[PDB]
Amino acid sequence: MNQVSGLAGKESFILTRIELFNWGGFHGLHQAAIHQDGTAVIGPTGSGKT
Amino acid sequence: MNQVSGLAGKESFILTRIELFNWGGFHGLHQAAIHQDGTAVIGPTGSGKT
Amino acid sequence: LGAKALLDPRFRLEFAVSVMDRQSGNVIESRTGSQGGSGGEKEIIASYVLTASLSYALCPAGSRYPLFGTIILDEAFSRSSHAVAGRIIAALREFGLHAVFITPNKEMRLLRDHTRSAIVVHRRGQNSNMASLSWEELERHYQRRGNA
Amino acid sequence: TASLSYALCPAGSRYPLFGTIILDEAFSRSSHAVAGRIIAALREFGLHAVFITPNKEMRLLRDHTRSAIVVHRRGQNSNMASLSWEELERHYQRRGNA
Amino acid sequence: DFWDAFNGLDREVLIQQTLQLLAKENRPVGLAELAELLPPAHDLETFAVWIGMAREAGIEVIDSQREFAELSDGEGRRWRFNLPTTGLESQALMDIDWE
Ligand SMILES: Nc1ncnc2c1ncn2[C@@H]1O[C@H](COP(=O)(O)OP(=O)(O)O)[C@@H](O)[C@H]1O
Ligand SMILES: Nc1ncnc2c1ncn2[C@@H]1O[C@H](COP(=O)(O)OP(=O)(O)O)[C@@H](O)[C@H]1O
Ligand SMILES: [Mg+2]
């Protein structure tokens, strides 16, 4: 799969990090890491994904 | 929870069988039984369940 | 509506779903609709309220069992987690209805716990069919003289 | 996805300068047979895909992404942590002692 | 629930394993026989997948004819599965290109 993944990071900007603070139910500071090859955000219904 | 079905089929009518013929993509006669304690219809996309 | 709210009994009162605390009894959510909500949460709100209204409609006054008991749920739990669909099924059971779920092979392990038959549907070319399946539990003993 | 891939390519360029495409409720109605084609087309158009799923089709995500963000609710505060698939697998193996 | 989903069935793995079994036996094989020889941990979904492959290759299923099987879970619970009557064939399944 990584053979196709060579396009990512080379040609185009790719998302790698998001930082929140007191946004919704996320009291205090937070952060999430996004892998250049693709990320999947999971959790129970109604927790903060959206 | 499941064993409460004993009241179903005694105090009320419940669906137990369906029959099709030349409806939608279902060419010719077809039949499907439904169980007293609940059921589930399962298949791939565009299978025909809807 | 001006005359409806004078001559029609149905328009003399305004409804609103509410959430009660089991212990204290204090209301937390005077939900008048589903604006907002996460989705899935929206789904459980809709399913609870609609099953309640269906039981009202199908039941003659003073009857605990509706003479018609079956309900259909297309794309059931299509956006609800296992924990939410479990309580949806619990509410359906409490109202006493027999639920016919439809799903595109999703949440299979959940239906496994709360149904006793399945109808597989498959398409090939310009044609489609179905087939029937069932299962049950051998409750007599998990293992004689063992841990159960 | 095709329209977006075209739109984000600067004039005279074959690859979009911006690559991140979100998909909320990514596969709420699609079996694996359809979601696989969705993934293949999404990757073909050059985009890097961020997916969201409420614990559905977990196996499919494992096959086309390398890290997951596990978010859980607790009262009125929600916490977020980032892990890799293998770290989460090790965590499950720790629960495998049960 | 998180780890139950994380422990979900891998459809393609079952595709390959069923193909290998059909190559080994090289004869009509019933669904109950596939259950006995390939005890599934996701019984119901695996049976759905099996009937799916059967229909994809055109191998019809005799719904009106019944066969049975027995399985168990990790917690000692045991279930008896009522199933239709059908027989897989390696050649037809191999001729179909799977997705
Ligand atoms: N601005 C808001 N409006 C309505 N509800 C909100 C809002 N912010 C937070 N909530 C609460 O916090 C959660 C926000 O929804 P969310 O979990 O992100 O949706 P989803 O589960 O589809 O990803 C919900 O559980 C909701 O109860
Ligand atoms: N009235 C129609 N208009 C367009 N397509 C239709 C129509 N009726 C049937 N089809 C075809 O037959 C199938 C009907 O939808 P269906 O298979 O029941 O969806 P699903 O399996 O996701 O529940 C689809 O494969 C569709 O392509
Ligand atoms: Mg959401």
Short mmCIF file of C-alpha atoms and ligand atoms in Angstrom, two decimals:
data_model
loop_
_atom_site.label_atom_id
_atom_site.label_comp_id
_atom_site.label_asym_id
_atom_site.label_seq_id
_atom_site.Cartn_x
_atom_site.Cartn_y
_atom_site.Cartn_z
CA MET A 1 0.00 0.00 0.00
CA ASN A 2 2.90 2.34 0.77
CA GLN A 3 3.82 2.31 -2.92
CA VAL A 4 0.76 4.49 -3.60
CA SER A 5 1.36 6.40 -0.36
CA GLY A 6 4.48 8.01 -1.83
CA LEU A 7 2.24 10.73 -3.29
CA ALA A 8 1.26 11.93 0.19
CA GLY A 9 3.70 14.37 1.78
CA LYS A 10 5.65 14.69 -1.47
CA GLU A 11 3.27 16.67 -3.69
CA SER A 12 0.60 18.07 -1.36
CA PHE A 13 0.04 19.35 2.15
CA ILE A 14 -1.36 16.69 4.48
CA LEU A 15 -3.06 17.10 7.85
CA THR A 16 -0.92 15.97 10.78
CA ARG A 17 -2.21 17.61 13.98
CA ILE A 18 -5.23 19.29 15.55
CA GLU A 19 -5.16 21.23 18.82
CA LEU A 20 -8.29 22.15 20.78
CA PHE A 21 -8.98 24.18 23.91
CA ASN A 22 -12.33 24.41 25.71
CA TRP A 23 -14.10 23.55 22.45
CA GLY A 24 -17.33 21.69 23.10
CA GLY A 25 -16.73 19.21 25.89
CA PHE A 26 -12.93 19.29 25.56
CA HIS A 27 -12.12 21.16 28.75
CA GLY A 28 -8.52 22.31 28.85
CA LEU A 29 -6.04 21.75 26.04
CA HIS A 30 -5.92 18.65 23.85
CA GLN A 31 -4.27 17.33 20.70
CA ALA A 32 -4.61 14.51 18.19
CA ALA A 33 -2.05 13.07 15.78
CA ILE A 34 -2.87 12.35 12.13
CA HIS A 35 -0.66 9.90 10.25
CA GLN A 36 0.32 11.04 6.77
CA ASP A 37 -0.96 7.75 5.31
CA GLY A 38 -4.49 8.04 6.74
CA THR A 39 -6.28 8.13 10.10
CA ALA A 40 -9.50 6.70 11.51
CA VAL A 41 -11.25 8.42 14.43
CA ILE A 42 -13.35 6.05 16.53
CA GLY A 43 -15.39 6.13 19.71
CA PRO A 44 -18.85 5.53 21.16
CA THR A 45 -21.83 7.43 19.82
CA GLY A 46 -21.88 11.06 20.88
CA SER A 47 -18.41 11.58 22.34
CA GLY A 48 -16.69 14.34 20.35
CA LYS A 49 -15.84 12.98 16.90
CA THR A 50 -17.88 15.63 15.11
CA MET B 1 -35.24 -9.41 27.18
CA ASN B 2 -35.56 -12.13 24.55
CA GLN B 3 -37.75 -14.41 26.67
CA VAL B 4 -40.43 -11.70 26.96
CA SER B 5 -41.58 -12.77 23.49
CA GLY B 6 -43.93 -15.24 25.20
CA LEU B 7 -46.55 -12.48 25.37
CA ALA B 8 -46.04 -11.80 21.66
CA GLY B 9 -48.13 -14.11 19.51
CA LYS B 10 -50.58 -14.54 22.40
CA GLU B 11 -51.85 -11.02 23.16
CA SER B 12 -51.36 -9.75 19.59
CA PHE B 13 -50.77 -10.69 15.97
CA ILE B 14 -47.21 -10.70 14.62
CA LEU B 15 -45.73 -11.15 11.15
CA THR B 16 -44.51 -14.68 10.44
CA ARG B 17 -44.14 -15.10 6.66
CA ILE B 18 -43.89 -13.07 3.46
CA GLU B 19 -44.41 -13.98 -0.20
CA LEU B 20 -43.29 -12.29 -3.41
CA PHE B 21 -43.76 -12.82 -7.14
CA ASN B 22 -42.37 -10.64 -9.94
CA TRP B 23 -41.84 -7.77 -7.49
CA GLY B 24 -38.84 -5.52 -7.97
CA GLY B 25 -35.80 -7.60 -8.85
CA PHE B 26 -37.38 -10.77 -7.41
CA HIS B 27 -38.32 -12.64 -10.57
CA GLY B 28 -40.73 -15.51 -10.03
CA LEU B 29 -42.00 -16.82 -6.73
CA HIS B 30 -40.06 -16.27 -3.52
CA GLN B 31 -40.70 -16.89 0.17
CA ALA B 32 -39.17 -15.85 3.49
CA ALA B 33 -40.16 -16.88 7.01
CA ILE B 34 -40.01 -14.60 10.06
CA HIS B 35 -39.38 -15.90 13.57
CA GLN B 36 -41.49 -15.07 16.62
CA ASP B 37 -38.60 -13.77 18.76
CA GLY B 38 -37.42 -11.21 16.20
CA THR B 39 -35.30 -11.42 13.07
CA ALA B 40 -32.83 -9.52 10.90
CA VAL B 41 -32.54 -9.20 7.11
CA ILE B 42 -28.95 -9.04 5.91
CA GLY B 43 -27.21 -8.63 2.57
CA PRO B 44 -24.84 -6.49 0.52
CA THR B 45 -25.50 -3.09 -1.00
CA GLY B 46 -28.39 -3.01 -3.45
CA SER B 47 -29.25 -6.59 -2.54
CA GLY B 48 -33.00 -5.94 -2.44
CA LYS B 49 -33.88 -5.85 1.25
CA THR B 50 -35.37 -2.36 1.13
CA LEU C 1 -54.55 26.82 12.69
CA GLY C 2 -56.33 29.79 14.25
CA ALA C 3 -59.62 27.88 14.36
CA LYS C 4 -57.89 24.54 14.95
CA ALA C 5 -56.53 25.83 18.25
CA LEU C 6 -60.13 26.54 19.32
CA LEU C 7 -62.24 23.66 17.97
CA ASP C 8 -59.72 20.79 17.71
CA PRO C 9 -58.74 18.94 20.92
CA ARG C 10 -55.41 17.89 19.38
CA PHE C 11 -54.25 21.52 19.16
CA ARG C 12 -55.13 22.48 22.75
CA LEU C 13 -51.78 21.20 24.07
CA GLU C 14 -48.14 21.27 23.00
CA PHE C 15 -45.90 18.22 23.45
CA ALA C 16 -42.24 17.97 24.40
CA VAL C 17 -39.97 14.99 25.04
CA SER C 18 -38.18 15.16 28.39
CA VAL C 19 -35.31 13.32 30.09
CA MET C 20 -35.71 12.46 33.79
CA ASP C 21 -33.04 11.56 36.33
CA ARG C 22 -33.83 8.10 37.69
CA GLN C 23 -32.71 8.90 41.24
CA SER C 24 -33.60 12.55 41.91
CA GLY C 25 -36.30 12.99 39.26
CA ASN C 26 -34.90 16.33 38.08
CA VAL C 27 -35.34 16.94 34.36
CA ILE C 28 -32.14 17.54 32.40
CA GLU C 29 -33.27 17.82 28.76
CA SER C 30 -36.65 19.32 27.85
CA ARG C 31 -36.03 18.16 24.30
CA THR C 32 -38.65 19.81 22.08
CA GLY C 33 -37.29 18.10 18.95
CA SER C 34 -33.94 16.87 17.70
CA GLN C 35 -32.17 20.10 16.70
CA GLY C 36 -28.55 19.59 17.61
CA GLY C 37 -27.73 16.23 19.09
CA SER C 38 -24.93 14.02 17.81
CA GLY C 39 -26.78 11.79 15.39
CA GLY C 40 -27.21 8.29 16.66
CA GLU C 41 -28.34 10.23 19.69
CA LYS C 42 -30.75 11.80 17.21
CA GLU C 43 -31.57 8.25 16.12
CA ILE C 44 -32.39 7.03 19.63
CA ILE C 45 -34.51 10.11 20.32
CA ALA C 46 -36.47 9.50 17.12
CA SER C 47 -36.84 5.76 17.69
CA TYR C 48 -37.96 6.08 21.31
CA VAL C 49 -40.54 8.76 20.59
CA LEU C 50 -41.86 7.09 17.44
CA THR C 51 -42.22 3.67 19.06
CA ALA C 52 -44.08 5.34 21.92
CA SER C 53 -46.44 7.10 19.50
CA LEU C 54 -46.91 3.88 17.52
CA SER C 55 -47.90 2.01 20.67
CA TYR C 56 -50.36 4.80 21.46
CA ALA C 57 -51.90 4.72 17.98
CA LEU C 58 -52.13 0.93 17.64
CA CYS C 59 -53.60 0.40 21.12
CA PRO C 60 -57.30 0.85 21.91
CA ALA C 61 -57.85 2.90 25.04
CA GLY C 62 -57.10 0.89 28.16
CA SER C 63 -55.30 -1.93 26.31
CA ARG C 64 -51.79 -2.91 27.37
CA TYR C 65 -51.15 -5.03 24.26
CA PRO C 66 -51.67 -3.56 20.78
CA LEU C 67 -53.66 -5.98 18.65
CA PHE C 68 -51.02 -5.39 15.97
CA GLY C 69 -47.52 -5.85 17.36
CA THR C 70 -44.97 -5.79 14.54
CA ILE C 71 -42.70 -2.87 13.64
CA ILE C 72 -40.18 -2.48 10.80
CA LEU C 73 -36.83 -0.67 11.05
CA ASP C 74 -34.94 -0.13 7.80
CA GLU C 75 -31.25 0.77 8.12
CA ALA C 76 -31.68 0.04 11.81
CA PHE C 77 -28.80 1.37 13.92
CA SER C 78 -27.11 2.62 10.74
CA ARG C 79 -25.49 5.40 12.81
CA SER C 80 -25.87 4.25 16.44
CA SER C 81 -23.23 2.53 18.55
CA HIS C 82 -23.78 -0.89 20.09
CA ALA C 83 -24.57 0.70 23.45
CA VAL C 84 -27.32 2.87 21.92
CA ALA C 85 -28.87 0.19 19.72
CA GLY C 86 -29.01 -2.09 22.75
CA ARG C 87 -31.19 0.38 24.64
CA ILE C 88 -33.27 1.00 21.51
CA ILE C 89 -34.00 -2.73 21.35
CA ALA C 90 -34.69 -2.69 25.09
CA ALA C 91 -37.31 0.03 24.65
CA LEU C 92 -38.86 -1.86 21.74
CA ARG C 93 -39.07 -4.94 23.97
CA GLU C 94 -40.62 -2.95 26.83
CA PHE C 95 -43.33 -1.61 24.52
CA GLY C 96 -43.81 -5.26 23.56
CA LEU C 97 -43.39 -4.99 19.79
CA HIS C 98 -41.76 -7.62 17.59
CA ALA C 99 -38.96 -5.92 15.66
CA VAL C 100 -37.94 -6.65 12.07
CA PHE C 101 -34.47 -5.17 11.63
CA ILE C 102 -32.73 -4.49 8.31
CA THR C 103 -28.99 -3.87 8.04
CA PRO C 104 -26.30 -4.08 5.32
CA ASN C 105 -24.40 -6.73 7.33
CA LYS C 106 -23.49 -4.08 9.93
CA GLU C 107 -23.67 -4.60 13.70
CA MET C 108 -24.04 -8.32 13.03
CA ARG C 109 -22.82 -9.27 16.51
CA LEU C 110 -25.62 -7.13 17.99
CA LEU C 111 -28.54 -8.72 16.15
CA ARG C 112 -26.94 -12.03 17.10
CA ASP C 113 -27.89 -11.34 20.72
CA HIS C 114 -31.48 -10.10 20.18
CA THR C 115 -32.85 -12.10 17.22
CA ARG C 116 -33.42 -15.78 16.49
CA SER C 117 -33.57 -15.87 12.67
CA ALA C 118 -32.14 -14.17 9.60
CA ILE C 119 -33.18 -13.77 5.96
CA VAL C 120 -30.18 -13.41 3.65
CA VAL C 121 -30.82 -11.54 0.39
CA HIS C 122 -28.41 -11.59 -2.54
CA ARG C 123 -28.37 -10.20 -6.08
CA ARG C 124 -26.77 -11.54 -9.25
CA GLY C 125 -27.25 -9.89 -12.63
CA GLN C 126 -30.80 -8.57 -12.96
CA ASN C 127 -32.20 -11.00 -10.36
CA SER C 128 -32.32 -11.48 -6.59
CA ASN C 129 -33.65 -13.95 -4.03
CA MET C 130 -33.63 -14.79 -0.33
CA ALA C 131 -32.91 -17.70 1.99
CA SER C 132 -33.90 -18.45 5.58
CA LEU C 133 -31.86 -19.17 8.72
CA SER C 134 -32.50 -19.66 12.43
CA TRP C 135 -30.75 -20.42 15.70
CA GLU C 136 -31.42 -21.05 19.38
CA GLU C 137 -29.75 -21.81 22.71
CA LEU C 138 -29.30 -25.23 24.34
CA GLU C 139 -30.05 -23.94 27.83
CA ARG C 140 -30.25 -27.41 29.41
CA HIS C 141 -26.65 -27.15 30.60
CA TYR C 142 -23.53 -25.35 29.42
CA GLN C 143 -21.40 -28.21 30.78
CA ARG C 144 -22.64 -30.82 33.24
CA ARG C 145 -21.02 -30.57 36.68
CA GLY C 146 -18.86 -27.65 35.54
CA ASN C 147 -18.73 -23.91 36.09
CA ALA C 148 -21.81 -22.09 34.79
CA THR D 1 -14.32 13.29 -4.55
CA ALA D 2 -13.47 13.58 -8.25
CA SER D 3 -14.82 17.13 -8.34
CA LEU D 4 -12.85 18.11 -5.23
CA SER D 5 -9.67 16.50 -6.57
CA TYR D 6 -9.97 18.56 -9.73
CA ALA D 7 -10.84 21.72 -7.81
CA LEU D 8 -7.83 21.54 -5.49
CA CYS D 9 -5.29 21.07 -8.29
CA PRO D 10 -3.63 24.42 -9.10
CA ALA D 11 -3.81 25.43 -12.74
CA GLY D 12 -1.32 23.38 -14.72
CA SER D 13 -0.84 20.83 -11.93
CA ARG D 14 -1.99 17.21 -11.72
CA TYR D 15 -1.94 16.89 -7.91
CA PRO D 16 -4.04 18.91 -5.44
CA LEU D 17 -2.03 21.32 -3.32
CA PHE D 18 -4.43 20.50 -0.46
CA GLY D 19 -4.83 16.78 0.12
CA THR D 20 -6.87 16.22 3.28
CA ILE D 21 -10.48 15.15 2.63
CA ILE D 22 -12.75 14.37 5.57
CA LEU D 23 -15.58 11.82 5.58
CA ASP D 24 -17.99 12.04 8.49
CA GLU D 25 -20.34 9.06 8.66
CA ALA D 26 -17.95 7.59 6.13
CA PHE D 27 -19.64 4.26 5.42
CA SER D 28 -22.94 4.33 7.32
CA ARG D 29 -24.81 2.63 4.46
CA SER D 30 -22.13 0.77 2.47
CA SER D 31 -21.08 -2.85 2.84
CA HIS D 32 -17.42 -3.79 2.45
CA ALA D 33 -17.97 -4.45 -1.26
CA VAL D 34 -18.84 -0.77 -1.81
CA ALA D 35 -16.55 0.76 0.82
CA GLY D 36 -13.53 -0.90 -0.77
CA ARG D 37 -14.33 0.75 -4.10
CA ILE D 38 -14.89 4.04 -2.27
CA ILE D 39 -11.44 3.73 -0.69
CA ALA D 40 -9.78 2.78 -3.97
CA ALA D 41 -11.31 5.73 -5.83
CA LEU D 42 -10.51 8.09 -2.95
CA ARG D 43 -6.84 7.10 -2.96
CA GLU D 44 -6.72 7.11 -6.76
CA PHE D 45 -7.67 10.79 -6.95
CA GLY D 46 -4.58 11.58 -4.87
CA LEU D 47 -6.31 12.63 -1.65
CA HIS D 48 -5.29 11.54 1.83
CA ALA D 49 -8.45 10.53 3.64
CA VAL D 50 -9.48 11.12 7.25
CA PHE D 51 -12.36 8.85 8.30
CA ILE D 52 -14.82 8.90 11.20
CA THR D 53 -16.83 5.88 12.31
CA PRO D 54 -18.70 5.15 15.58
CA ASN D 55 -17.11 1.70 15.97
CA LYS D 56 -18.56 0.31 12.71
CA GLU D 57 -16.60 -1.71 10.15
CA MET D 58 -13.52 -1.57 12.38
CA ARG D 59 -11.77 -4.18 10.24
CA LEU D 60 -11.97 -2.01 7.12
CA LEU D 61 -10.26 0.97 8.75
CA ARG D 62 -7.42 -1.27 9.92
CA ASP D 63 -6.74 -2.21 6.29
CA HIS D 64 -6.29 1.29 4.83
CA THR D 65 -5.11 3.55 7.69
CA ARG D 66 -2.14 3.45 10.04
CA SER D 67 -3.28 5.33 13.16
CA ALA D 68 -6.52 5.91 15.07
CA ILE D 69 -7.78 8.59 17.45
CA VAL D 70 -9.82 7.06 20.28
CA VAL D 71 -12.22 9.57 21.84
CA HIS D 72 -14.39 8.69 24.84
CA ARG D 73 -17.05 10.52 26.83
CA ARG D 74 -17.07 11.02 30.60
CA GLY D 75 -19.83 13.17 32.06
CA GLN D 76 -19.63 16.61 30.48
CA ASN D 77 -15.95 16.32 29.46
CA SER D 78 -14.57 14.40 26.48
CA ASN D 79 -10.98 13.16 26.22
CA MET D 80 -8.98 12.37 23.09
CA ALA D 81 -5.88 10.21 22.66
CA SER D 82 -3.92 9.24 19.55
CA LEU D 83 -2.51 5.73 19.10
CA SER D 84 -1.28 3.44 16.36
CA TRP D 85 -3.07 0.28 15.27
CA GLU D 86 -0.31 -1.87 16.76
CA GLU D 87 -0.30 -0.08 20.12
CA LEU D 88 -4.08 -0.56 20.29
CA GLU D 89 -3.60 -4.22 19.36
CA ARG D 90 -1.15 -4.58 22.24
CA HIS D 91 -3.69 -2.90 24.53
CA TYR D 92 -6.31 -5.42 23.42
CA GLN D 93 -3.84 -8.25 24.03
CA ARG D 94 -3.40 -6.94 27.57
CA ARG D 95 -7.18 -7.26 27.91
CA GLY D 96 -6.70 -10.72 26.41
CA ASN D 97 -5.55 -11.84 29.85
CA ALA D 98 -9.22 -11.64 30.87
CA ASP E 1 -18.07 -2.93 22.61
CA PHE E 2 -14.89 -1.24 21.36
CA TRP E 3 -12.86 -4.44 21.63
CA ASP E 4 -15.72 -6.61 20.40
CA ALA E 5 -15.72 -4.59 17.18
CA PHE E 6 -11.91 -4.54 17.23
CA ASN E 7 -12.13 -8.35 17.29
CA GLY E 8 -14.38 -8.34 14.22
CA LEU E 9 -14.43 -10.92 11.46
CA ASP E 10 -11.95 -10.54 8.60
CA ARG E 11 -14.05 -11.39 5.56
CA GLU E 12 -11.19 -11.87 3.08
CA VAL E 13 -9.39 -14.27 5.43
CA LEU E 14 -12.50 -16.45 5.50
CA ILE E 15 -12.74 -16.19 1.71
CA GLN E 16 -9.22 -17.57 1.38
CA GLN E 17 -9.61 -20.26 4.05
CA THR E 18 -12.86 -21.53 2.53
CA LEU E 19 -11.18 -21.62 -0.88
CA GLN E 20 -8.31 -23.69 0.55
CA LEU E 21 -10.75 -26.09 2.23
CA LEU E 22 -12.72 -26.50 -1.00
CA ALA E 23 -9.48 -27.20 -2.85
CA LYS E 24 -8.49 -29.80 -0.25
CA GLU E 25 -11.79 -31.70 -0.19
CA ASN E 26 -12.67 -31.21 -3.88
CA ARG E 27 -16.27 -32.34 -3.40
CA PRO E 28 -19.70 -30.88 -2.59
CA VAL E 29 -19.62 -29.68 1.02
CA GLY E 30 -22.56 -28.62 3.15
CA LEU E 31 -22.77 -25.52 5.33
CA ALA E 32 -22.82 -27.58 8.53
CA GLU E 33 -19.70 -29.39 7.32
CA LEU E 34 -17.98 -26.04 6.75
CA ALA E 35 -19.00 -25.03 10.27
CA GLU E 36 -17.55 -28.22 11.77
CA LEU E 37 -14.31 -28.06 9.76
CA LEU E 38 -13.94 -24.26 10.12
CA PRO E 39 -15.47 -23.41 13.51
CA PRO E 40 -16.31 -19.70 13.29
CA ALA E 41 -16.01 -17.21 16.13
CA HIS E 42 -18.58 -15.00 14.37
CA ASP E 43 -20.94 -17.83 13.46
CA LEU E 44 -23.92 -15.88 12.11
CA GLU E 45 -21.92 -13.44 9.99
CA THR E 46 -19.71 -16.26 8.68
CA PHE E 47 -22.81 -18.21 7.63
CA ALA E 48 -24.13 -15.09 5.91
CA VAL E 49 -20.80 -14.74 4.08
CA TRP E 50 -20.91 -18.42 3.08
CA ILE E 51 -24.40 -18.15 1.60
CA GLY E 52 -23.22 -14.98 -0.11
CA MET E 53 -20.37 -16.76 -1.86
CA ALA E 54 -22.72 -19.62 -2.73
CA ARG E 55 -25.14 -17.25 -4.47
CA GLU E 56 -22.43 -15.12 -6.10
CA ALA E 57 -21.12 -18.11 -8.06
CA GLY E 58 -24.68 -19.12 -8.97
CA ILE E 59 -24.74 -22.13 -6.61
CA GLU E 60 -28.41 -22.19 -5.63
CA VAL E 61 -29.59 -22.98 -2.10
CA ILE E 62 -32.49 -25.30 -1.26
CA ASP E 63 -34.27 -23.19 1.36
CA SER E 64 -37.08 -25.70 1.93
CA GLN E 65 -34.53 -28.38 2.93
CA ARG E 66 -33.10 -28.11 6.44
CA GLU E 67 -29.80 -29.17 8.02
CA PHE E 68 -28.49 -28.45 11.52
CA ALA E 69 -25.24 -27.70 13.35
CA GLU E 70 -23.80 -26.99 16.80
CA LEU E 71 -21.38 -24.29 17.98
CA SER E 72 -20.12 -22.66 21.17
CA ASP E 73 -18.75 -19.37 22.50
CA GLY E 74 -15.80 -18.40 24.66
CA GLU E 75 -17.98 -18.36 27.79
CA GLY E 76 -19.24 -21.94 27.41
CA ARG E 77 -22.60 -21.00 25.90
CA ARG E 78 -23.77 -23.38 23.17
CA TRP E 79 -26.17 -22.76 20.29
CA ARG E 80 -27.85 -25.00 17.73
CA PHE E 81 -28.02 -23.46 14.26
CA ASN E 82 -30.81 -24.26 11.80
CA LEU E 83 -29.54 -23.79 8.25
CA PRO E 84 -30.56 -24.35 4.62
CA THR E 85 -29.32 -27.20 2.46
CA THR E 86 -26.66 -26.40 -0.14
CA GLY E 87 -23.31 -27.64 -1.41
CA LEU E 88 -20.31 -25.52 -2.36
CA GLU E 89 -18.12 -26.38 -5.34
CA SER E 90 -14.51 -25.23 -5.63
CA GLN E 91 -14.54 -24.65 -9.40
CA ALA E 92 -17.44 -22.19 -9.46
CA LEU E 93 -16.12 -20.21 -6.48
CA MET E 94 -12.64 -19.98 -8.01
CA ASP E 95 -14.07 -18.87 -11.37
CA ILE E 96 -15.58 -15.86 -9.58
CA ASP E 97 -13.25 -12.92 -8.94
CA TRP E 98 -13.83 -11.76 -5.38
CA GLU E 99 -13.85 -8.24 -3.96
N1 LIG F 1 -23.14 22.72 20.30
C1 LIG F 1 -23.86 21.54 20.73
N2 LIG F 1 -25.14 21.42 20.44
C2 LIG F 1 -25.83 20.33 20.83
N3 LIG F 1 -25.21 19.35 21.53
C3 LIG F 1 -23.91 19.47 21.82
C4 LIG F 1 -23.22 20.55 21.44
N4 LIG F 1 -21.94 20.42 21.86
C5 LIG F 1 -21.82 19.26 22.51
N5 LIG F 1 -23.04 18.71 22.47
C6 LIG F 1 -22.93 17.43 23.18
O1 LIG F 1 -21.73 16.92 23.06
C7 LIG F 1 -21.79 15.84 21.86
C8 LIG F 1 -21.55 16.55 20.53
O2 LIG F 1 -21.95 15.75 19.46
P1 LIG F 1 -20.88 14.68 18.82
O3 LIG F 1 -20.54 13.62 19.83
O4 LIG F 1 -19.62 15.40 18.42
O5 LIG F 1 -21.59 14.00 17.50
P2 LIG F 1 -21.14 12.56 16.83
O6 LIG F 1 -21.31 11.46 17.85
O7 LIG F 1 -22.01 12.27 15.64
O8 LIG F 1 -19.70 12.64 16.41
C9 LIG F 1 -22.98 15.31 21.95
O9 LIG F 1 -22.94 14.14 22.87
C10 LIG F 1 -23.88 16.40 22.54
O10 LIG F 1 -24.70 15.86 23.48
N1 LIG F 2 -37.59 2.04 -8.96
C1 LIG F 2 -36.15 1.88 -9.09
N2 LIG F 2 -35.42 2.90 -9.49
C2 LIG F 2 -34.08 2.77 -9.62
N3 LIG F 2 -33.48 1.60 -9.34
C3 LIG F 2 -34.23 0.56 -8.93
C4 LIG F 2 -35.55 0.67 -8.80
N4 LIG F 2 -36.05 -0.51 -8.38
C5 LIG F 2 -35.04 -1.38 -8.24
N5 LIG F 2 -33.95 -0.69 -8.58
C6 LIG F 2 -32.80 -1.61 -8.45
O1 LIG F 2 -33.09 -2.68 -7.75
C7 LIG F 2 -32.41 -2.52 -6.29
C8 LIG F 2 -33.40 -1.86 -5.35
O2 LIG F 2 -32.77 -1.38 -4.19
P1 LIG F 2 -32.28 -2.43 -3.02
O3 LIG F 2 -31.46 -3.54 -3.63
O4 LIG F 2 -33.48 -3.03 -2.32
O5 LIG F 2 -31.36 -1.58 -1.94
P2 LIG F 2 -30.64 -2.20 -0.60
O6 LIG F 2 -30.17 -3.61 -0.87
O7 LIG F 2 -29.46 -1.34 -0.22
O8 LIG F 2 -31.64 -2.21 0.54
C9 LIG F 2 -31.33 -1.81 -6.49
O9 LIG F 2 -30.20 -2.71 -6.84
C10 LIG F 2 -31.67 -0.90 -7.68
O10 LIG F 2 -30.58 -0.76 -8.48
MG MG F 3 -20.92 13.14 14.65
#
